[PDB]
Design a protein around this ligand. Structure first.
Ligand SMILES: *[C@@H]1O[C@H](CO)[C@@H](O)[C@H](O)[C@H]1NC(C)=O
Lengths: 48, 48, 38
């Protein structure tokens, strides 16, 4: 019973931390940012 | 206006489709540029 | 919800994305949709 309660509490804490705008997913956002920056630079290079 | 045609505005030549625009050009403005310095808007020489 | 995309490579029949598209740069969609991964 104690182990079950501890596991449930840990899962609840994980949910609360994730939902409170923790900005934890930096690694997944970096890919999108870099790809978009590369494409925008490629397009903007046409003014030279 | 609404057909894919070649156009020549005061020696500025191009190919594309012409449509009526809502942009607010000032009296001393005649051209509109894009991120890649591509002409996007034009003032008609006669009908303004 | 936490992470937002820029272009998912879906239908773009009709900003920066239009400027990219008019200059010959396009994005292709993944084979496995999110439902299959779920
Ligand atoms: C001639 O040029 C004037 C310039 O303002 C323009 O208003 C007019 O429509 C043009 N055509 C004729 C037939 O006057």
């Amino acid at each position: 019973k104690l182990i079950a309660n501890q596991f449930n509490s840990a899962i609840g804490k994980i949910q609360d931390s994730l939902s409170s705008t923790a900005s934890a997913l930096g690694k997944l956002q970096d890919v999108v940012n870099h790809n978009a920056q590369a494409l925008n630079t490629l397009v903007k290079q046409l003014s030279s | 206006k609404n057909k894919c045609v070649n156009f020549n505005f005061n020696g500025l030549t191009g190919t594309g489709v012409l449509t009526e625009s809502n942009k607010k050009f000032l009296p001393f403005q005649q051209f509109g540029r894009d991120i890649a310095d591509t002409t996007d808007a034009v003032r008609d020489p006669q009908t303004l | 919800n936490k992470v937002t995309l820029a272009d998912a490579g879906f239908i773009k029949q009709y900003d920066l994305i239009c400027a990219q598209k008019f200059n010959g740069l396009t994005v292709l969609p993944p084979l496995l949709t999110d439902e299959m991964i779920a």
